[PDB]
């Protein structure tokens, strides 16, 4: 979804590569609400490539427009006018978040404003013309998906956005526990999710397809992509989220895409985190994992390869796909069928044969030492050399499907090509040491070690933490969002109840509407610049306390006493634990 | 200051799957090291039964679907990993499951062979529709720990057999804690053992002990 | 290595031999000279 | 004339090539030079 | 000349070297790297690479 | 001097080896040519003047020989 | 040493193992030996361990800046497909574990292996050949790990009481092995001020003179007052080295390790730094150093300081709005008002943080971090430069702890981008220079 | 049930006091599991006799000093803490050391009551300056582990009674670490290394078997529950 919506200054008809000066790369004041400043490449392309903003819109003349709500006499109307950069500087832009008055009016004594400089100034709200449609106008879709964006430095945020697009679909595809607003809206607009275009009811649900009977009496059906190798090898598989009798409404989600769950983007899993440095194994950005993440296939993902070989017309003959190979053991052919192609469902190892092929040869002139053995063992020197498709080095998996295009069969082929066969191999990749994981804040690191669930820092419950992140790289990199969502990640997991004793505590004064209670495992969303605030966090830190028995596992500082799984003794100090959303 | 009252291990019950265990008295600074020595052994070496491979008629491999079934074969095997089974017989024993017509298949629909039991038949496997038919057999073995699926190219298996990650872990969750003192001050630890219902917290702790006793030698 | 013998003495990098050839194709006469031995041939 | 080898802590060895070691020693920090 | 050539301004360097009819003694270490010789530094210096080693007569006795 | 015990490649220590040769470079050719000598024996011809390790590599042998002053050299 | 993926090692040494397994009866001819390795028959692995024994390899990470960018190591077969790198060589390689990769080369000829073991061996190269300073010196965790061990805490558990009247001193221990038996029990704290009798350690030069002066003590007992950790700390240094009894900053460890290279052989420093590593890590995890929204503190004076300078700017803004002030001096006045106002919050912030807070301990010990970095986390981020390079008179009042605003965030990126773009062309230019220096 | 690879316990002797022990191979991760439990059994689980309290003539309300000897009160207390004596009583016993000779006093000067035996006679206690006397009483009661000096509120009743830190166990230092083994057959198996510096009362090998037996019997409390599950040898 980000590839489309991307805008670039390169290519024919524009400044190309080194020619461009660095002044262009600098973010202009007019990029607000049009081109996202935070999302760009880290390398030599910085600032030349950028993603269109969320509410931005293109003009028939090629100029980007941004939505605004015009204000008149200190009252913001419902009139929304898309303005080009030229006409924006003409007016004054009130700030997205300003105190709202009843039926609406400017409540604050003075209002934030933007000038043609741009310049930031104030007035009494009398002189304002247009106001922002909402926060995160300047942000793009990927940027708007980073919880606690406002807390992280642009450096680590840019790394955070770029690394969401680098994630991979897992088998389970669990959604984020602490999210933002975009998770659901971006999954449906991606096109990898199945949406219903007419109100109706489900006639059938199968792994193969889902059919709906509309109120119209019309009948729509949807064939589900199943284990479709993507461009880069990721797995495109979809799954139905609806049952047979279910009612549905126009524009609902019938089935999940690769990275989506229940309609919203899931780019990773929620994991139990521990921020203590641990025995030098997580150091210098390295990470350690619970072996549970292996046994339970939480980080497992599927990858598929496409191998291809053709049989063409050679000046010396015709290439023939066949099971006969000039010199081979009958064992190496054990998995080949009659035609010489690997049998579906077989396992393949590096160097194993996939499609046997042979091409004609020309005057051989065998070595005298090679002809003597030919006579002794009586193997007649064959007339054709062996050119055969074999699995690449260091690659293995199971054969999924085969696609054969023959000349005998009509089909179509370029001149000279009689037969073309494609073999699709797939494999389940467990999370392994050396793989690269990361969160939405720009924090990235390889898996340095994976420990048995037996010896791991584990809460008084006996619940081992899944990941252990080092404490040193956290403070200097200026991304503190990862800690916040680490606390909130624990909030949403165990639930909470705000005190109903007397009234509402002072930290809730301006704060959540009927968020006073949530069950265990409930999901949270904190829009980037409108999201939760520090005060409300602490108030939630103390909160509902089962595990099974009624003891609290985490204090109001977000810390807990972990027991070393090796020596068996508690760690001297309270360690911060929680749930963080990390991507493969 | 020799103080001898030989250690006493008394049982208890909390739930049916888990029961606490307590051992007193003990010298100061012990229960910690002694508790984690059981927990480390409980979470790993408790023997059990688990399904190694599975064979479904229509499917030759893991990545396809089955007609009428709502769950793809890979997402069905994910569900089947949750099966908690106990095999009282050595050597591989194959189970069987066959279901037709609409419904919802569950672990209970599996027919256990002699001396094997499905301890959570309530588990959901796959939801079948009118056209859906699911015929699959399961091979249960005995072992301990977590063994990754053994590829059929490594074993003598044939292209139809689907190997699966096998988890033999009767034990579920474990913890402990100690009451120190400050008369001389001793220490007493209480442990909480929980199991998957294939065995009771008692037989597990006896397994650890029986397994932990044989190890110490001199 | 397969015979467990001592690794031999290196030869002339093929890339360099290609260099002299590409320089000759430019009408540059590049002669590899011995100490007193005048011209040397690469063959 | 050269003096002690910074790596060895002793008078430089006769084989040492100090030109390259000098060039690298000057350039390597250049990544840290603000401009 | 072939050390100046590989460095920069190759065409410029070669045209002046062919007119001056230059001869390269191959003393510098970059020259020896290109042709695959032993650089005249470190273990490549004469005194080091010409070291001769034999066991002491007293040692050969002990066998 | 007690350095404790060096493991494998680090034994013998370079410090004790450098007193047997002019520089670190001379030490290289020193042990290098001797190792090439040893392997010829297993197929100049002389050594392993010390008691060879089980599988010990000839280059590792020549290093132990130089440590014991079992051979001498003359620079060019 | 270095961890080498067994698969990788097999191919690297393929011709070697092919001969070894033919020498042994495992394979009858070289053809069988080749196929035996290709299909990875289990017999080869025991063979691979033999060929790899004491056979070094070179490890490179690009870009290669100084010759330390290539170092030999003794290979060790490792499970998994990744490479295990010693944590002390990250400095020389500038290696982050964020997913960097490294190249392995196999020296073949006797001379090549000699040069590997002798010239390029990892333990022989410690100090950088530019400043002479130590490189493999501990850093990051190992810093804070030791800084915690050696630090001395007032009123710790079991602290020597200097007893009076009815009780003896109470702070003395027969030996260090006793302070351990007391530490395992809740009696002793590793950071305590107690004084101990040490048979196996060497006293400082000064005290050694007054105490003995007839010689030194291998067995001769003496007593000093030090934290139990400082004892164990000095057990890592050579038995011949004097007792330091200090809390170790990074620079202090630089002084010590720098000194060991002058007074001791290389092999000694190689082993001493290994021992500092194991010790530093163990105590880094027991250090109780984590991060939390709570452990991040903001000074309460930030409000008053902020609002105070606001009026000072509003008055100067009222003087500029009066027409008398010079436009260039107005912003310059604001830039000066806010610039040193940031120092106040920095001064107030440092005063607030308890010395044992995990965030400051990281910066104090010199393991990692700056004060200017912790000033933008809590308190205020400060002024940010404009695109043209001028200082935007509008400061960032919020800190990344409280979060920035819509406009505060858009402005920071103005500068934050220019910096990241600089790092882009700072490497391309710095490398072009180095190529001319080399030539 | 369970049948595994046979581990082997070996012992390397660093000295008469110290010995190193290693177990190979273990099953992963069993090395870490039983390792910390052994350091505790050897340290705190072995019965032994040690000094509890001491009173010396000439010190009542004095803080620290002993005219006539160059050793202070502190230096002598920790000088006696090293006394190693095996007492068969199962009750406190008061020994006595009295010497007026201007010479070096040693552990051999004390007269042990019947049933208590001093294993380190060569131990130095105090150096008596010319023309001075030394009188000391010693309380010896069997115990286990390390019991810090205890003032029970009955220590304030005695005038001049000094409670001392008691080292009950014979092993004064122990440590452990784990390593990997098993080239091919086993991959990344655990090897346990344990260091034991023992007092002359008991050799390292005997402290092991004593810790082995006290440890094995302790886990019998669980095994007696069922005995169903098992392992091999």
Quote the DSSP letter at residue G301: T
**Whether G27 contacts G98, CB under 8 Å:** no
Q: How far apart are CA B45 and CA E3, in angstroms?
A: 68
Note down the domain range covering F62.
Answer: 1-76
Residue pair A425/A304 in contact by the 8 Å Cβ criterion: yes
Domain chopping of chain H, boundaries = 1-47+169-222, 48-168
The 10 Å Cβ neighbour count of residue A122 is 12
Beta bridge partners of residue C40, listed in sequence order: C32
Q: Do chains D and C touch (3 or more CB pairs under 8 A)?
A: no
| Residue B212 contacts H, CB cutoff 8 Å | yes
Whether F and H touch (3+ CB pairs < 8 Å), yes or no? no
Task: Produce one character per residue of A41-68: b if its CB has 16 or more CB atoms within 10 Å, e if not.
Answer: eeeebbbbbbbbbbbbeeeeeeebbbbb
Contacts of B28 in chain G (CB under 8 A): 185
Chains B and D touch (3+ CB pairs under 8 A): no
Of residues A155, A170, A139, the one with CA closest to residue A236: A170
Q: For residues A446 and A440, give the distance between their C-alpha atoms in angstroms, rounded to a whole number.
A: 15
Cα G417 from Cα A31, distance rounded (Å)? 14
Interface touch A446/G293, C-beta < 8 Å: no
> What is the SS3 assignment for H99?
strand
**Mutation target vs F (from E46, E53, E55; most F CBs, 10 A cutoff):** E53
Which of A506, A514, A526 lies closest to A581, judged by CA? A526
Q: Are H95 and H112 in contact (CB under 8 A)?
A: yes
d(CA A431, CA A289): 9
Q: Write out the DSSP string of E2-60.
A: HHHHHHS-HHHHHHHHHHTT------SHHHHHHHT---SSGGGSHHHHT-EEEE-HHHH
* Rounded (10°) CA dihedral A446, A451, A452, A454: -130
Instruction: Kindly state whether F18 is in contact with chain E, defined as any CB-CB distance less than 8 angstroms.
Output: no
Task: Tell me A30's DSSP state.
Answer: G
Q: Do G115 and E7 touch (CB under 8 A)?
A: no
Which residue of H26, H27, H29, H192 to mutate against A (max A Cβ within 10 Å)? Answer: H29
Q: CB G108 to CB C6 under 8 A?
A: no
Q: Quickly count: other Cβ atoms within 10 Å of residue A481's Cβ.
A: 28
CA distances from B55 to A344, B51, B78 (A): 15, 11, 15
What's the CA gap between G85 and A283, in Å, rounded? 12
Neighbour count for residue B22 (Cβ, 10 Å): 15
Q: CB-based contacts of G326: which residues, under 8 Å, 6+ apart?
A: none
CB A524 within 8 A of CB A180: no
Pairing of strands A268-274, A467-468: parallel
Number of domains chain F contains = 1
Rounded CA separation A478/G382 (Å) = 14
Suggest the residue from G79, G181, G220, G277 to mutate for an interface test with chain H (most H CBs closer than 10 A).
Answer: G181
Give the closest residue to G270 by CA, choosing from G107, G71, G415, G108: G71
Q: How many CB pairs under 8 A join G and H?
A: 63
Peptide bond into A534 cis (omega under 30): no
Peptide bond into G74 cis (omega under 30): no
Cβ-Cβ contacts under 8 Å, A342 against chain B: none
Output the CA–CA distances (angstroms, integers) from residue B32 to A8, A561, B181, B193, G182, in the order listed: 61, 14, 14, 15, 17
Instruction: Decide if C41 touches F, using CB distance below 8 A.
Output: no
To 5 degrees, how large is the angle CA F57–CA F61–CA F62?
A: 120
Contact H32 A569 (CB under 8 A): no
Q: Residue H148's closest CA among H130, H134, H167? A: H167
In sequence order, what are the beta bridge partners of H24?
A: H8
Closest chain G CA to residue E49: G111
Nearest CA in chain H to G183: H146
In chain G, whose CA is at the least distance from the CA of F55?
G50
- The per-residue b/e assignment along G406-421, b for 16 or more CB within 10 angstroms, e otherwise, is bbbbbbbbbbbbbebb
Residues in E touching C34 (Cβ below 8 Å): none
Helix (H) or strand (E) holding B176: strand B171-179
Q: How far is it, in rounded angstroms, from Cα A47 to Cα A38?
A: 10
What is the Cα–Cα distance from G159 to G194, expressed in whole angstroms?
5
Task: Return the C-alpha torsion angle A192, A197, A201, A204, nearest 10.
Answer: -40
Integer Cα distance of A115 and A129 in angstroms? 11
**Is the CB of residue A54 less than 8 Å from the CB of residue A186?**
no
Q: Which residue numbers of G belong to the known binding site? A: 96, 98, 100
Resolution (A): 3.1
What is the span of the domain harbouring residue A120? Answer: 49-131
Tell whether omega for the bond before H134 is within 30 degrees of 0, i.e. cis: no
G372 φ, ψ to 5°? -60, -30
Cis omega before residue G424 (within 30°)?
Answer: no
Q: Which of the residues G115, G125, G129, G389 would you substitute to probe the D interface, choosing the one with the greatest number of D C-beta atoms within 10 Å? A: G129
Candidates G156, G185, G195; CA nearest to G356 is G156
Element (H, E) at H223: helix H204-223
CA-CA distance, A477 to A480, in Å (whole number)?
A: 8
CA-CA distance, G33 to G48, in Å (whole number)? 13
Q: How far apart are CA A425 and CA A302, in angstroms?
A: 11
Question: CA nearest H176 in A: which residue?
Answer: A567
Residue of B168, B140, B1, B138 lying closest to B76 (CA atoms): B138
Q: Does residue A30 contact residue A79 with C-beta atoms inside 8 Å?
A: no
Element (H, E) at A172: none
Nearest to E34 among C16, C29, C33 (CB): C16
Instruction: Check the annotation: does D1 bind a ligand.
Output: yes
Residues in a beta bridge with A190: none
CA distance G176 to G195: 10
SS3 of G21-61: HHHCCCCCCHHHHHHHHHCCCCHHHHHHHHHHCCCCEEEEC
> Which secondary-structure segment (H or E) carries H64?
none
- Please count the other Cβ atoms lying within 10 Å of the Cβ belonging to residue H64: 16
Give CA A117 to chain center in angstroms: 38
CA pseudo-torsion sign D29, D35, E4, E5: positive
Q: How far apart are CA A132 and CA A76, in angstroms?
A: 10
| Whether A578 contacts A559, CB under 8 Å | no
The residues facing A288 across adjacent strands are: A449, A468
Residue A553 CA: distances (Å) to CA of A544, A550, A562, H8:
10, 9, 10, 42
Rounded-to-integer distance, Cα C23 and Cα C18, Å = 9
Its sign, for the CA torsion G404, G406, G412, G417, is positive
Cα–Cα dist H195/H42, whole Å: 11
Alpha carbon dihedral G352, G355, G359, G361, in 10-degree steps, equals 150
CB-based contacts of A506: which residues, under 8 Å, 6+ apart? none
Q: What are phi and psi of G361, to 5 degrees?
A: -50, -35
Q: Do E60 and F25 touch (CB under 8 A)?
A: no
- Cβ atoms within 10 Å of B159's Cβ, excluding its own: 16
Sort G224 into a burial class: Cβ within 10 Å, 0-12 / 13-18 / 19+: middle
How far apart CA H222 and CA G30 sit, in angstroms, is 58
Q: How many beta carbons lie within 10 A of that of residue H116, not counting itself?
A: 19
Q: Is there a contact between A352 and A323 (Cβ–Cβ < 8 Å)?
A: no
Nearest chain D residue to E30 by CA distance is D20
Rounded to 5 degrees, φ, ψ at D29 are -70, -15
The DSSP line for A306-363 is EEEEEEEEETTEE-EE-S--SS--TTTTTTB-TTSBBPTT-EE-TT-EEE-EEEE---
Q: Which residues are CB-contacts of A57 (< 8 A; sequence separation ≥ 6)?
A: A64, A65, A66, A67, A82
What's the gap in Å between the CA of C1 and the closest CA on chain G?
6
Contact A490, A579 (CB under 8 A): yes
A339-368: b (≥16 Cβ within 10 Å) or e: ebbbebbbbbeeebbbbbbbbebeeeeeee
Residue A290 has phi, psi (to 5 degrees) of -75, 135
What Å distances lie between residue E8 and C18, E18, G193, G436, CA to CA? 20, 17, 66, 10
Strand-pair partners of H163: H53
Indicate if the alpha-carbon torsion angle G66, G68, G72, G78 is positive or negative.
Answer: negative
Q: What does the angle CA C29 – CA C32 – CA C34 come to, to the nearest 5 degrees? A: 140
Shortest Cα distance, chain D CAs vs residue G67, angstroms: 8
Q: Strands, DSSP E only, in G199-282?
A: 222-225
């Amino acid at each position: 979804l980000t590839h489309k919506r991307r805008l670039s200054a390169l290519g024919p008809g524009g400044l190309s590569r080194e020619r461009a000066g660095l002044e262009v790369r600098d973010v202009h004041p007019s990029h607000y609400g049009r081109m996202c400043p935070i999302e760009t490449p880290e390398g030599p392309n910085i600032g030349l490539i950028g993603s269109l903003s969320v509410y931005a819109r293109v003009n028939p003349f090629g100029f980007i427009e941004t939505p605004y709500r015009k204000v008149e006499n200190g009252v913001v109307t419902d009139q929304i006018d898309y303005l080009t950069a030229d006409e924006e500087d003409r007016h004054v832009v009130a700030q997205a978040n300003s105190p709202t008055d009843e039926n609406g009016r400017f409540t604050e004594d003075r209002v934030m404003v933007r000038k043609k400089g741009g310049e930031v100034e104030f007035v009494s709200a009398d002189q304002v013309d247009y106001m922002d449609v909402s926060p995160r106008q300047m942000v793009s879709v990927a940027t708007a998906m980073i919880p606690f964006l406002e807390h992280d430095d642009a450096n680590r945020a840019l790394m955070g956005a770029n690394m969401q697009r680098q994630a991979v679909p897992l088998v389970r595809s669990e959604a984020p526990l602490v999210g933002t607003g975009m998770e659901l809206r971006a999954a449906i607009d991606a096109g990898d999710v199945v949406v219903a275009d007419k109100t109706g009811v489900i006639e059938e649900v199968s792994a193969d397809y889902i059919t709906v009977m509309a109120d119209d009496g019309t009948r729509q059906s949807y064939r589900l992509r199943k284990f479709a190798r993507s461009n880069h090898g990721t797995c495109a598989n979809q799954r139905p989220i609806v049952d047979a009798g279910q009612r549905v409404e126009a524009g609902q989600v019938i089935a999940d895409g690769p990275c989506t769950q229940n309609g919203e983007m899931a780019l990773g899993k929620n994991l139990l985190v521990a921020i203590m440095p641990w025995e030098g194994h997580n150091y210098e950005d390295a990470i350690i994992l619970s072996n549970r993440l292996v046994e339970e296939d939480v980080l497992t993902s599927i990858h598929i390869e496409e191998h291809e070989i053709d049989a063409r017309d050679t000046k010396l003959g015709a290439e023939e796909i066949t099971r006969d190979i000039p010199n081979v053991s009958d064992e190496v052919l054990a998995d080949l069928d009659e035609r010489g192609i690997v049998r579906i469902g077989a396992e393949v190892r590096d160097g194993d044969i996939l499609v046997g092929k042979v091409t004609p040869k020309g005057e051989t002139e065998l070595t005298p030492e090679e002809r003597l053995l030919r006579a002794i063992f009586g193997e007649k020197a064959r007339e054709v050399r062996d050119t055969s498709l074999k699995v690449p080095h260091g690659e293995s998996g199971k054969v999924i499907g085969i696609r054969v295009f023959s000349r005998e069969d009509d089909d179509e082929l370029p001149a000279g090509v009689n037969e073309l066969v494609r073999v699709y191999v797939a494999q389940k990749r467990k999370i392994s040491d050396g793989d690269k994981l990361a969160g939405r804040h720009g924090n990235k690191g390889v898996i340095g070690k994976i420990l048995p669930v037996e010896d791991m820092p584990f809460l008084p419950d006996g619940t081992p933490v899944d990941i252990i992140l080092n404490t040193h790289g956290v403070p200097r990199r200026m991304n503190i969002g990862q800690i916040l969502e680490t606390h909130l990640g624990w909030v949403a997991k165990a639930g909470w109840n705000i005190d109903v004793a007397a009234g509402v505590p002072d930290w809730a004064s301006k704060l959540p509407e009927e968020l006073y209670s949530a069950p265990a495992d409930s999901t949270v969303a904190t829009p980037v610049f409108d999201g939760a605030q520090e005060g409300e966090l602490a108030g939630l830190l103390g909160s509902t306390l089962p595990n099974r028995d009624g003891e609290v596992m985490v204090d109001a500082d977000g810390k807990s006493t972990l027991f070393d799984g090796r020596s068996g003794e508690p760690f001297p100090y309270p360690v911060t634990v929680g749930y963080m959303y990390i991507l493969k | 200051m020799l103080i001898s009252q030989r250690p006493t291990l008394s049982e208890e019950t909390v739930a049916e799957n888990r029961s606490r265990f307590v051992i007193e008295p003990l010298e100061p600074g012990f229960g910690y090291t002694l508790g984690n020595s059981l927990r480390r052994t409980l979470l790993s070496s408790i023997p059990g039964a688990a399904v190694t491979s599975i064979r479904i008629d229509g499917v030759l491999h893991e990545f396809t679907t089955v007609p009428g079934v709502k769950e793809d074969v890979t997402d069905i095997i994910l569900n089947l990993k949750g099966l908690v089974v106990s095999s009282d017989d050595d050597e591989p024993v194959t189970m069987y499951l066959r279901k037709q017509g609409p419904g919802v298949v569950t672990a209970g629909d599996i027919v256990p062979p002699a001396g094997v039991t499905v301890h959570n038949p309530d588990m959901h496997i796959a939801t079948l529709n009118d056209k859906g038919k699911l015929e699959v057999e399961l091979v249960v073995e005995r072992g301990r720990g977590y063994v990754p699926a053994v590829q059929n190219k490594a074993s003598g298996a044939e292209i139809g057999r689907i190997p699966v990650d096998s988890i033999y872990s009767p034990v579920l969750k474990v913890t402990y804690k100690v009451e120190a003192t400050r008369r001389t001050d001793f220490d007493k630890l209480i442990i909480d053992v929980e199991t998957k219902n294939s065995i009771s917290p008692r037989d597990a702790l006896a397994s650890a002990g029986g397994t932990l006793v044989e190890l110490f030698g001199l | 290595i397969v015979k467990g013998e001592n690794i031999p003495e290196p030869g002339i990098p093929e890339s360099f031999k290609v260099l002299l050839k590409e320089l000759q194709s430019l009408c540059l006469n590049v002669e590899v000279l011995s100490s007193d031995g005048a011209a040397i041939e690469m063959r | 004339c050269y003096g002690r080898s910074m790596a060895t802590g002793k008078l430089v060895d006769i084989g040492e090539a100090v030109g390259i070691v000098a060039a690298q020693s000057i350039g390597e920090p250049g990544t840290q030079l603000t401009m | 000349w072939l050390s100046a050539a590989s460095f920069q301004e190759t065409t410029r360097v070669l045209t002046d070297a062919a007119i001056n009819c230059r001869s390269d003694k191959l003393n510098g270490l970059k020259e020896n790297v290109i042709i695959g010789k032993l650089i005249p530094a470190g273990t490549g210096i004469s005194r080091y690479r010409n070291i001769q080693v034999q066991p002491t007569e007293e040692a050969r006795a002990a066998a | 001097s007690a350095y404790d015990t060096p493991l494998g490649i680090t034994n013998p220590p370079i410090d004790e080896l450098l007193s047997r040769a002019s520089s670190k470079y001379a030490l290289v050719i020193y042990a290098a040519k001797r190792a090439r000598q040893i392997n010829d024996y297993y197929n100049e011809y002389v050594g392993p003047l010390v008691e060879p390790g089980l599988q010990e590599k000839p280059l590792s042998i020549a290093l132990r020989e130089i440590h014991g002053d079992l051979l001498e050299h003359t620079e060019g | 040493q270095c961890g080498l993926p067994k698969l990788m090692a097999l191919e690297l040494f393929k011709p070697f193992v092919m001969k070894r397994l033919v020498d042994l009866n495992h394979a009858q001819n070289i053809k069988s030996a080749k196929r035996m390795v290709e299909r990875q028959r289990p017999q080869v692995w025991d063979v691979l361990e033999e060929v790899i024994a004491e056979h070094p390899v070179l490890l490179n990470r690009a870009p290669t800046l100084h010759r330390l960018g290539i170092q030999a190591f003794e290979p060790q077969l490792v499970e998994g497909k990744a490479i295990q790198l010693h944590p002390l060589v990250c400095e020389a390689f500038n290696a982050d574990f964020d997913g960097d990769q490294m190249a392995v080369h196999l020296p073949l000829s006797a001379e090549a292996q000699a040069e590997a073991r002798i010239l390029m061996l990892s333990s022989n190269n410690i100090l950088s050949p530019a400043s002479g300073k130590p490189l493999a010196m501990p850093r990051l965790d190992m810093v804070t790990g030791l800084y915690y061990l050696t630090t001395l805490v007032e009123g710790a558990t079991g602290e020597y009481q200097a007893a009076t009247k009815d009780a003896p001193e109470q702070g003395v221990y027969s030996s260090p092995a006793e302070a351990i038996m007391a530490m395992d029990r809740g009696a002793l704290s590793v950071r305590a001020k107690i004084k101990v009798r040490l048979t196996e350690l060497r006293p400082p030069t000064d005290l050694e003179a007054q105490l003995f002066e007839n010689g030194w003590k291998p067995g001769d007992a003496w007593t000093a007052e030090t934290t139990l950790g400082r004892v164990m700390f000095n057990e890592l240094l050579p038995k011949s080295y004097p007792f330091v009894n200090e809390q170790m900053h990074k620079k202090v460890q630089a002084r010590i390790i720098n000194d060991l290279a002058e007074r001791f052989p290389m092999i000694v420093v190689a082993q001493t730094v290994d021992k500092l590593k194991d010790a530093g890590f163990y105590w880094a995890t027991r250090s109780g150093v984590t991060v939390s929204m709570a452990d991040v503190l903001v000074p309460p004076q930030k409000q008053e300081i902020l609002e105070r300078h606001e009026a000072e700017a509003d008055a100067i803004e009222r003087k500029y709005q009066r027409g008398a002030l010079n436009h260039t001096e107005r912003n310059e006045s604001l830039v000066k008002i806010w610039q040193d106002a940031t120092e106040e919050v920095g001064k107030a912030l440092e005063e607030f943080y308890p010395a044992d807070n995990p965030i400051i301990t990281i910066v104090k010990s010199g393991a990692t971090g700056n004060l200017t970095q912790t000033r933008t986390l809590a308190g205020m981020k400060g002024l940010v430069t404009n695109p043209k390079g001028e200082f935007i008179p509008r400061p960032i009042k919020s800190s990344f702890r409280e979060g920035l605003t819509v406009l505060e965030y858009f402005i920071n990126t103005h500068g934050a981008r220019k910096g990241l773009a600089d790092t882009a062309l700072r490497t391309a230019d710095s490398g072009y220079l180095t190529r001319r220096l080399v030539d």
